[PDB]
């Protein structure tokens, strides 16, 4: 399940991926500098996913898998999208953009992708 604290820390194609997502360089750079922290409370199909970034600014997110849900995209951008569950993976899709998240070896890891580049993430599990 996706539950407990997590420590986002090693990433790939981060700057290109965020630039394609459409993000300002100052926050791309400072976000990388700030090791991101994350926490999740899976709840029988419902979820309350949370983030802490660019100076640990907290943000809350939430959805039910299979259903469309509103997904804020930082204080500024926003979109609606469907979060999904293909067994262990927490699959998800967006207009012209896709990702899948997954727990492996009791670690939160993900395989995000956009435009024409991957974006693996790694986030150790902790409490
Ligand atoms: C890519 C987004 C921002 C990550 C971040 O913190 N970046 C640093 C700031 S910026 O980029 O540099 O501006 C994050 C913020 C909230 C995220 C969403 C929410 O956490 C809710 C779910 C969580 C699921 O595990 C994956 C799908 C998802 C629907 C997430 C997709 C994506 O990872 C989002 C939209």
XYZ file of N, CA and C and ligand atoms in Angstrom:
416
model
N 0.835 -1.191 0.000
C 0.000 0.000 0.000
C 0.867 1.236 0.000
N 0.295 2.421 -0.320
C 1.077 3.653 -0.352
C 0.736 4.360 0.936
N 1.491 4.111 2.031
C 1.137 4.689 3.326
C 2.397 5.042 4.082
N 2.355 6.042 4.995
C 3.525 6.353 5.813
C 4.305 7.482 5.195
N 5.438 7.879 5.819
C 6.226 8.980 5.271
C 7.100 8.451 4.161
N 7.642 9.359 3.318
C 8.579 8.965 2.272
C 9.565 10.098 2.066
N 10.794 9.841 1.556
C 11.824 10.881 1.484
C 12.317 11.004 0.060
N 11.635 11.797 -0.802
C 12.084 11.932 -2.189
C 13.484 12.499 -2.206
N 14.404 11.974 -3.056
C 15.813 12.344 -2.918
C 16.646 12.105 -4.166
N 16.612 10.922 -4.833
C 17.391 10.725 -6.062
C 16.439 10.671 -7.237
N 16.732 11.389 -8.348
C 15.783 11.504 -9.456
C 16.530 11.488 -10.773
N 15.824 11.370 -11.927
C 16.491 11.402 -13.231
C 15.731 12.312 -14.171
N 16.378 12.889 -15.215
C 15.683 13.818 -16.112
C 14.778 14.771 -15.360
N 15.181 15.232 -14.156
C 14.273 16.047 -13.357
C 14.053 17.375 -14.039
N 15.137 18.119 -14.352
C 14.958 19.461 -14.898
C 14.244 19.426 -16.226
N 14.613 18.509 -17.147
C 13.932 18.477 -18.441
C 12.469 18.181 -18.207
N 12.156 17.140 -17.404
C 10.758 16.785 -17.166
C 9.981 17.967 -16.637
N 10.503 18.676 -15.610
C 9.747 19.791 -15.042
C 9.636 20.900 -16.061
N 10.709 21.196 -16.826
C 10.607 22.249 -17.833
C 9.501 21.909 -18.809
N 9.401 20.635 -19.252
C 8.329 20.259 -20.176
C 6.995 20.383 -19.473
N 6.875 19.924 -18.205
C 5.620 20.106 -17.471
C 5.223 21.565 -17.542
N 6.202 22.501 -17.495
C 5.908 23.921 -17.676
C 6.089 24.575 -16.332
N 7.362 24.736 -15.899
C 7.653 25.168 -14.533
C 8.750 26.213 -14.580
N 8.803 27.171 -13.620
C 9.783 28.254 -13.709
C 11.146 27.790 -13.253
N 12.245 28.224 -13.915
C 13.565 27.701 -13.570
C 13.887 27.881 -12.105
N 13.579 29.051 -11.501
C 13.944 29.253 -10.101
C 13.407 28.130 -9.244
N 12.130 27.717 -9.430
C 11.581 26.654 -8.589
C 12.082 25.305 -9.056
N 12.426 25.096 -10.349
C 13.020 23.813 -10.735
C 14.280 23.657 -9.911
N 15.171 24.673 -9.954
C 16.483 24.538 -9.324
C 16.330 24.403 -7.829
N 15.549 25.302 -7.190
C 15.418 25.246 -5.735
C 14.710 23.974 -5.334
N 13.734 23.483 -6.130
C 13.091 22.221 -5.784
C 14.123 21.115 -5.763
N 15.023 21.021 -6.770
C 16.036 19.967 -6.730
C 16.882 20.150 -5.490
N 17.365 21.387 -5.229
C 18.223 21.610 -4.066
C 17.537 21.094 -2.820
N 16.231 21.397 -2.658
C 15.505 20.944 -1.474
C 15.165 19.481 -1.654
N 15.716 18.535 -0.854
C 15.285 17.144 -1.002
C 13.805 17.137 -0.709
N 12.954 16.581 -1.603
C 11.511 16.678 -1.395
C 11.124 15.634 -0.378
N 10.090 15.900 0.455
C 9.606 14.900 1.401
C 8.162 14.659 1.033
N 7.617 13.457 1.321
C 6.270 13.120 0.872
C 5.618 12.266 1.929
N 4.268 12.251 2.016
C 3.604 11.379 2.979
C 2.272 10.971 2.404
N 1.777 9.740 2.680
C 0.544 9.283 2.046
C -0.311 8.573 3.063
N -1.656 8.602 2.901
C -2.533 7.858 3.796
C -3.527 7.127 2.920
N -3.116 5.990 2.306
C -4.067 5.224 1.501
C -5.225 4.836 2.392
N -6.465 4.751 1.856
C -7.632 4.540 2.707
C -8.700 3.785 1.947
N -8.429 2.503 1.603
C -9.452 1.677 0.968
C -9.963 2.313 -0.302
N -9.067 2.542 -1.291
C -9.431 3.155 -2.573
C -9.327 4.659 -2.486
N -9.706 5.299 -1.355
C -9.504 6.740 -1.223
C -8.062 6.984 -0.845
N -7.502 8.185 -1.127
C -6.122 8.484 -0.745
C -6.039 9.923 -0.289
N -5.083 10.258 0.611
C -4.790 11.659 0.913
C -3.292 11.780 0.748
N -2.827 12.028 -0.497
C -1.391 12.093 -0.754
C -0.922 13.473 -0.370
N 0.323 13.653 0.134
C 0.771 14.982 0.547
C 2.178 15.222 0.060
N 2.607 16.502 -0.023
C 3.922 16.826 -0.574
C 4.576 17.870 0.298
N 5.908 18.062 0.164
C 6.613 19.082 0.940
C 7.791 19.508 0.090
N 7.864 20.748 -0.456
C 8.879 21.017 -1.475
C 9.246 22.476 -1.613
N 10.403 22.780 -2.255
C 10.832 24.166 -2.433
C 10.716 24.896 -1.117
N 11.583 24.575 -0.134
C 11.393 25.112 1.210
C 10.339 24.324 1.952
N 10.096 23.039 1.601
C 9.130 22.243 2.352
C 7.749 22.850 2.374
N 7.346 23.662 1.367
C 5.996 24.216 1.394
C 5.031 23.054 1.331
N 4.193 22.828 2.371
C 3.310 21.668 2.345
C 2.202 21.874 1.343
N 1.728 20.780 0.702
C 0.527 20.851 -0.124
C -0.220 19.552 0.052
N -1.572 19.552 -0.030
C -2.331 18.317 0.135
C -2.898 17.937 -1.211
N -3.042 16.620 -1.479
C -3.677 16.159 -2.709
C -4.518 14.959 -2.349
N -5.498 14.558 -3.186
C -6.359 13.445 -2.802
C -7.142 12.945 -3.990
N -7.612 11.678 -3.948
C -8.340 11.123 -5.086
C -8.874 9.758 -4.724
N -9.802 9.195 -5.533
C -10.206 7.804 -5.356
C -9.834 7.091 -6.633
N -9.193 5.900 -6.568
C -8.680 5.293 -7.794
C -9.842 4.817 -8.632
N -9.746 4.912 -9.980
C -10.870 4.556 -10.840
C -11.763 5.744 -11.121
N -11.816 6.777 -10.241
C -12.740 7.892 -10.437
C -11.944 9.084 -10.913
N -12.576 10.051 -11.622
C -11.861 11.279 -11.957
C -11.727 12.068 -10.676
N -10.644 12.858 -10.498
C -10.492 13.656 -9.283
C -9.844 14.975 -9.626
N -10.062 16.045 -8.823
C -9.400 17.310 -9.119
C -8.008 17.217 -8.550
N -6.962 17.583 -9.325
C -5.587 17.455 -8.856
C -4.974 18.836 -8.906
N -4.773 19.522 -7.756
C -4.085 20.809 -7.813
C -2.678 20.564 -8.302
N -2.030 21.576 -8.921
C -0.703 21.383 -9.495
C 0.114 22.556 -9.007
N 0.408 22.557 -7.686
C 1.128 23.660 -7.048
C 0.249 24.888 -7.008
N 0.551 25.869 -6.125
C -0.296 27.056 -6.025
C -0.162 27.868 -7.290
N -0.959 27.561 -8.340
C -0.858 28.321 -9.583
C -1.489 27.553 -10.719
N -0.996 26.319 -10.981
C -1.559 25.497 -12.052
C -2.543 24.521 -11.452
N -3.442 23.937 -12.281
C -4.429 22.986 -11.771
C -5.004 22.192 -12.921
N -5.363 20.904 -12.722
C -6.066 20.170 -13.773
C -6.882 19.057 -13.161
N -7.791 18.421 -13.938
C -8.521 17.254 -13.445
C -7.951 16.033 -14.125
N -7.965 14.850 -13.467
C -7.320 13.677 -14.058
C -7.760 12.416 -13.358
N -7.465 11.219 -13.924
C -7.948 9.976 -13.321
C -6.785 9.229 -12.718
N -6.858 8.852 -11.417
C -5.797 8.061 -10.800
C -6.293 6.634 -10.853
N -5.399 5.629 -10.980
C -5.825 4.257 -11.246
C -4.957 3.300 -10.464
N -5.367 2.017 -10.314
C -4.563 1.049 -9.570
C -4.461 -0.227 -10.372
N -3.291 -0.524 -10.986
C -3.109 -1.797 -11.680
C -2.318 -2.680 -10.745
N -2.993 -3.263 -9.725
C -2.293 -4.140 -8.795
C -1.336 -3.320 -7.967
N -0.049 -3.721 -7.846
C 0.873 -2.953 -7.017
C 1.053 -1.539 -7.514
N 0.963 -1.277 -8.840
C 1.235 0.073 -9.323
C 0.046 0.968 -9.073
N 0.299 2.277 -8.843
C -0.761 3.272 -8.694
C -0.695 4.042 -9.995
N -1.342 3.505 -11.057
C -1.225 4.085 -12.398
C -1.938 5.414 -12.445
N -1.620 6.306 -13.413
C -2.341 7.574 -13.521
C -2.175 8.138 -14.916
N -3.115 8.983 -15.408
C -2.973 9.567 -16.740
C -3.380 11.024 -16.713
N -2.901 11.842 -17.685
C -3.259 13.262 -17.744
C -3.351 13.688 -19.198
N -3.943 14.839 -19.615
C -3.830 15.233 -21.013
C -2.386 15.306 -21.470
N -2.001 14.610 -22.567
C -0.636 14.716 -23.091
C 0.428 14.560 -22.024
N 0.246 13.613 -21.075
C 1.230 13.422 -20.004
C 0.839 12.172 -19.235
N 1.777 11.298 -18.788
C 1.387 10.075 -18.079
C 2.399 9.719 -17.012
N 2.013 8.909 -15.997
C 2.980 8.452 -14.998
C 2.493 7.169 -14.371
N 3.387 6.402 -13.701
C 2.934 5.316 -12.837
C 3.750 5.360 -11.566
N 3.158 5.081 -10.379
C 3.925 5.063 -9.132
C 3.926 3.646 -8.613
N 4.882 3.255 -7.735
C 4.972 1.851 -7.331
C 5.764 1.703 -6.051
N 5.454 0.711 -5.182
C 6.298 0.455 -4.016
C 7.189 -0.714 -4.374
N 8.531 -0.626 -4.186
C 9.418 -1.747 -4.502
C 10.370 -1.940 -3.342
N 10.599 -3.182 -2.847
C 11.516 -3.368 -1.724
C 11.174 -2.479 -0.551
N 9.875 -2.191 -0.310
C 9.500 -1.271 0.765
C 10.160 0.079 0.574
N 10.178 0.585 -0.682
C 10.676 1.931 -0.975
C 9.678 2.548 -1.925
N 9.424 3.875 -1.889
C 8.486 4.460 -2.846
C 9.317 4.820 -4.050
N 9.028 4.244 -5.241
C 9.757 4.608 -6.453
C 8.734 4.855 -7.532
N 9.053 5.623 -8.598
C 8.041 5.922 -9.609
C 8.672 5.989 -10.976
N 7.860 5.915 -12.058
C 8.390 5.996 -13.417
C 7.524 7.015 -14.123
N 7.836 8.322 -13.955
C 7.023 9.359 -14.588
C 7.531 9.593 -15.988
N 6.718 10.191 -16.891
C 7.156 10.372 -18.276
C 6.369 11.484 -18.930
N 6.959 12.277 -19.860
C 6.209 13.367 -20.486
C 6.832 13.745 -21.809
N 6.049 14.257 -22.791
C 6.640 14.695 -24.052
C 7.442 13.568 -24.659
N 8.773 13.518 -24.418
C 9.578 12.415 -24.932
C 10.740 12.138 -24.010
N 10.480 11.973 -22.689
C 11.566 11.681 -21.754
C 11.017 11.026 -20.506
N 11.742 10.066 -19.883
C 11.251 9.454 -18.649
C 11.504 10.379 -17.483
N 11.173 9.933 -16.251
C 11.493 10.707 -15.051
C 11.376 9.773 -13.871
N 12.358 8.854 -13.727
C 12.327 7.938 -12.595
C 12.448 8.744 -11.327
N 11.759 8.325 -10.238
C 11.930 8.977 -8.944
C 12.302 7.919 -7.937
N 12.959 8.302 -6.821
C 13.230 7.347 -5.750
C 12.904 8.051 -4.459
N 12.305 7.352 -3.469
C 11.930 8.023 -2.233
C 11.942 7.001 -1.121
N 12.882 7.090 -0.149
C 13.011 6.009 0.827
C 11.817 6.043 1.746
N 11.452 4.910 2.392
C 10.256 4.872 3.230
C 10.682 5.062 4.662
N 9.844 5.711 5.502
C 10.245 6.012 6.876
C 9.027 6.460 7.653
N 9.151 6.804 8.955
C 7.978 7.204 9.731
C 8.371 8.120 10.860
C 4.527 16.926 -10.569
C 3.798 17.699 -9.434
C 4.832 18.578 -8.650
C 5.961 17.821 -7.894
C 6.792 18.843 -7.148
O 6.637 18.946 -5.940
N 7.622 19.593 -7.826
C 8.413 20.637 -7.183
C 7.732 21.997 -7.450
S 7.804 22.401 -9.205
O 7.378 21.253 -9.981
O 9.286 22.570 -9.372
O 7.158 23.684 -9.400
C 2.969 16.772 -8.481
C 2.298 17.573 -7.318
C 1.037 16.778 -6.876
C 1.182 15.458 -7.660
C -0.063 14.531 -7.742
C -0.591 14.234 -6.311
O 0.495 13.897 -5.435
C -1.695 13.143 -6.289
C -1.275 11.847 -7.041
C -0.212 11.024 -6.247
C 0.154 9.710 -6.986
O 1.148 8.964 -6.269
C 0.652 10.008 -8.421
C -0.437 10.804 -9.178
C -0.839 12.159 -8.511
C -2.079 12.658 -9.321
C 0.326 13.224 -8.500
C 0.921 13.613 -9.892
C 2.149 14.574 -9.775
O 3.222 13.906 -9.087
C 1.784 15.897 -9.027
C 0.836 16.781 -9.906
